[PDB]
Design a protein around this ligand. Structure first.
Ligand SMILES: C[C@]12CC[C@H](O)C[C@@H]1CC[C@@H]1[C@@H]2CC[C@]2(C)C(=O)CC[C@@H]12
Ligand SMILES: C[C@]12CC[C@H](O)C[C@@H]1CC[C@@H]1[C@@H]2CC[C@]2(C)C(=O)CC[C@@H]12
Lengths: 267, 267
């Protein structure tokens, strides 16, 4: 048991993903200009973003969003289920992806499809991944926190290096059809962030529609195969030892050096 | 099972300590002016200090120090064994104690006995205590690191609050018969520290005697009932989470406020 789908240098969940499909996503999937895409390193806040975009679509009514699953309202192009859905779906399409740039649909780079890339403090991302993946069946889990930590810094985890994932997509931060958001600005000022998404997508909204959306898309609202049915806590500081923080800092600085430090809002 | 000897508001090991004896240590034990005493909050570096004082006595020859146990070469006045030994021992006497000031022999405060008080970064002290006490039989051990941490900050551990232990003895830092040392200066500059101990005790040494002592009393040299025979790792930063460090800082500052911050060499 290796416990993961090794594809083109990137690890993938054993289930729901086939090598062949991955090869198609890159070589054949067709991106439409009308498409709206959510790009995120896993555990960076995809659902919140996704949920916000659905609220903007329904103009506040959270009933469909409440009935339909995440994977249905915004499928993962790279997955079996999703790749299928997206293909036979009427434009305009809303989907998500955790794929690094070198494996993203080739048709995309020739299109005018709008992409919203959401990044988050990697430390939180690491914490969030640990407690998520170690609660998933049929997935190589870590012997301990110490081990997973090591994995993450090495990029050996599902979807590869965070640093890599970030470096690849950053050269697009200034394209007109590319909106770079931070999970921190999303949680700190959901309205300003919704405002940005609104201009970027070119969607206008009546005052009362914005209020409902702002209402139904708050951190309070948001808060609402499994190894332990029970879990179905804090902040990264509640998990990194002081030594891991210093080592992590040193690592973050060494790998993100070639980038404007001011891109990453977190201290 | 309570698992500890509660005496006058301070917890004690269940074995080797009797309430009655404790009452005597305070009320009856007689301190001689010729006495040399090592005062330390447990896990602050008593053995290193003790080992240094024996080396200074033997002028370098570490054979007795090698054959005789710590509890024999410098007994704990508060213990059954030690209280016995100290009583029927010829002056000058060298012993140790972890007792807070309000429980120290009353005869002491009228004597001219020389006391060396060694303190150490409480964070290390906490780490060192956890891995020590949880490897001792017949001693209430913590359910986890989180719990012990909480105990220590509350002073609920053996020998009570560190902060308390420190506050009580600090008013003596300027007495002529009282030498205040830091474990950090002992590890950083063993020679200067041995120099201080030498003047304080008024002991002179031939160059070759100092070299041997300096040799036999280095951090390298130093490094050399048990639940796990095996253990018979890092620094405090390898154990406190970032959150515990910040909470600890905040706590240290709130409790040590009434003292010159510059007394504590650690950052
Ligand atoms: C693991 C994950 C992608 C990594 C995410 O941040 C956690 C997601 C859980 C839901 C998964 C999804 C991959 C594709 C799946 C398998 C589907 O198509 C339906 C369930 C979907
Ligand atoms: C626990 C301790 C005092 C707290 C120390 O930092 C760890 C020491 C271990 C050796 C113990 C000593 C108390 C008194 C004892 C019981 C003796 O008299 C012989 C063995 C001695």
């Amino acid at each position: 048991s290796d416990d993961f789908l090794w594809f083109e240098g990137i690890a993938f969940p054993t289930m729901g993903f086939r090598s062949e499909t991955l090869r198609k996503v890159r070589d054949e999937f067709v991106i439409r200009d009308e498409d709206v895409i959510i790009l995120t390193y896993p555990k960076s806040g995809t659902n919140w973003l996704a949920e916000i975009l659905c609220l903007m679509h329904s103009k506040g009514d959270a009933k469909w969003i409440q009935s339909v699953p995440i994977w249905e309202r915004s499928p993962w192009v790279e997955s079996e289920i999703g790749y299928t859905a997206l293909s036979e779906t009427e434009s305009p399409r809303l989907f998500s992806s955790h794929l690094p740039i070198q494996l993203f649909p080739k048709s995309f780079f020739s299109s005018k499809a709008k992409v919203i890339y959401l990044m988050r403090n990697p430390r939180d991302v690491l914490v969030s991944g640990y407690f998520f993946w170690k609660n998933m069946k049929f997935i190589k889990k870590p012997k301990s926190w110490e081990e997973y930590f090591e994995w993450f810094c090495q990029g050996t985890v599902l979807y590869g290096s965070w640093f890599d994932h970030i470096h690849g997509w950053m050269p697009m931060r200034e394209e007109k059809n590319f909106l770079l958001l931070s999970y921190e600005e999303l949680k700190q000022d959901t309205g300003r962030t919704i405002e940005k998404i609104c201009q970027f997508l070119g969607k206008t909204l009546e005052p009362e529609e914005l209020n409902l959306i702002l209402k139904n898309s708050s951190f309070q609202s948001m808060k609402e195969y499994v190894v332990d049915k029970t879990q179905l806590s804090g902040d990264w500081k509640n998990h990194f030892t002081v030594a891991q923080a210093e080592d992590f800092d040193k690592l973050f600085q060494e790998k993100m050096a070639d980038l404007p430090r001011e891109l990453f809002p977190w201290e």
